[PDB]
């Protein structure tokens, strides 16, 4: 689901993923840290640019 959200849009909200997937905060954080970085006022951005 996280990878699909990243394919649909470059910016992914952590709270929306936590609400949809019904998972705890630490699991969503580990999922995002593997492929995203925290950008202030924008959420989570994919670590690599569009190739």
């Amino acid at each position: 689901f996280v990878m699909w959200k990243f394919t649909q849009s470059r910016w992914v909200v952590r709270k929306e993923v936590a609400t949809v997937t019904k998972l705890c905060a630490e699991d969503v954080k580990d999922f995002l840290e593997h492929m995203a970085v925290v950008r202030i006022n924008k959420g989570w951005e994919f670590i690599l640019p569009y190739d």
């Binding site: 936590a18 019904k22 998972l23 705890c24 699991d27």
Partner: protein, 343 residues
């Protein structure tokens, strides 16, 4: 001259680079030659005044002009300790299976404020652990955590898996004693914040207890303190020895608080002036600039005290100040009656 220095010593408190000067109250008869500092009730009633600048729920700010540091500190200490309120003292536990310790649980419950009006109750006599209708209140807390019968297959979050897993203070139910139900309308006797997290539970664990609350003062224990932060500060009055203009004036706006020093273009050039010395916190950053040290004179007004009283929500802070003044009056009356009984 000498008169100006005497007036500055007797009216202002100057803050130097290394230390504060003129901090002691000196307006007393015999200390000054050209001043008759003898007590005068008429002059005190004339000069004294109270001006409230901000007043909302659980927050008050008011300036008192004409009072001294001794009476101000007395009021502050009475508000901090000598104002009686209602707080949890006795905890009767029935099969506490929580991970949180029983003593720690009782200590956390004791710190929870109670919205009950303390003036309508009395101090419990020595002993008498059973308690009476007049001088005690009972709060029942019974929370049984169990698994949610309807939840998702994964349910990683504890909110979906379990119910009542976080025992908030809203679960506390006031149990009337005698005729307290008729005297107090429903909804008056309750926890103040209603959102304080007492403990966290798991399925199988249960927390069952009764809480006996009695009247008490903050001096005995800090849990009876009604005010969260009740303090007072001297009103600052920043003065400019020489007119400061140009870009250095902007430095003034960056040296003091952003809201005290304002720059204006009277003739197309920026000149700084004191707009609202109240907002300044006296960070003493002007001493870093070498040139701007001898151009300003930071000072505090001796007979102008801004009181800020943020309460815990038991009662509005104006009633708190009134009750503090009443407690001081009661102490004075008790000592006068004792002296009269002696003579």
């Amino acid at each position: 001259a000498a008169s100006q220095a005497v007036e500055e010593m007797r009216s202002r408190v100057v803050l130097g680079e290394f230390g504060v000067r003129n901090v002691h109250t000196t307006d007393f008869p015999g200390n000054y030659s050209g001043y008759d500092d003898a007590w005068d009730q008429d002059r005190f009633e004339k000069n004294f005044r109270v001006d409230v600048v901000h007043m909302d729920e659980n927050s008050l700010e008011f300036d008192m002009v004409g009072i001294d540091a001794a009476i101000a500190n007395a009021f502050r200490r009475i508000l901090l300790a000598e104002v009686p309120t209602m707080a949890v003292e006795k905890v009767l536990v029935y099969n506490n299976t929580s991970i949180v310790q029983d003593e720690i649980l009782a200590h956390r419950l004791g710190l929870i404020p109670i919205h009950a009006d303390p003036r309508l109750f009395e101090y419990r006599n020595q002993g008498d652990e059973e308690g009476t209708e007049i001088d005690t209140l009972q709060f029942r807390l019974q929370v049984r955590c169990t698994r949610n019968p309807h939840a998702a297959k994964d349910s990683s979050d504890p909110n979906e898996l379990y119910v009542n897993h976080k025992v908030y203070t809203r679960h506390m139910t006031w149990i009337p004693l005698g005729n307290q139900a008729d005297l107090f309308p429903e909804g008056t006797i309750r926890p103040v914040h209603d959102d304080i997290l007492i403990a966290q539970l798991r399925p199988g664990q249960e927390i069952d207890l009764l809480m006996h609350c009695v009247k008490g003062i903050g001096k005995d224990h800090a849990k009876f303190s009604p005010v969260a932060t009740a303090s007072y500060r001297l009103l600052p009055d920043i003065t400019l020895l020489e007119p400061v203009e140009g870009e250095a004036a902007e430095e003034l706006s960056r040296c003091f608080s952003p809201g005290v020093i304002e720059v204006q273009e009277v003739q197309g050039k920026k000149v700084a002036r004191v707009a609202n010395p109240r907002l300044d916190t006296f960070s003493r950053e002007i001493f870093r600039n070498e040139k701007l040290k001898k151009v300003v004179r930071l000072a505090r007004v001796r007979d102008h005290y801004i009181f800020s009283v943020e309460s815990t929500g038991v009662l509005p802070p104006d009633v708190l100040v009134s009750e503090a003044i009443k407690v001081l009056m009661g102490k004075c009356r008790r000592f006068l009656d004792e002296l009269d009984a002696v003579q």
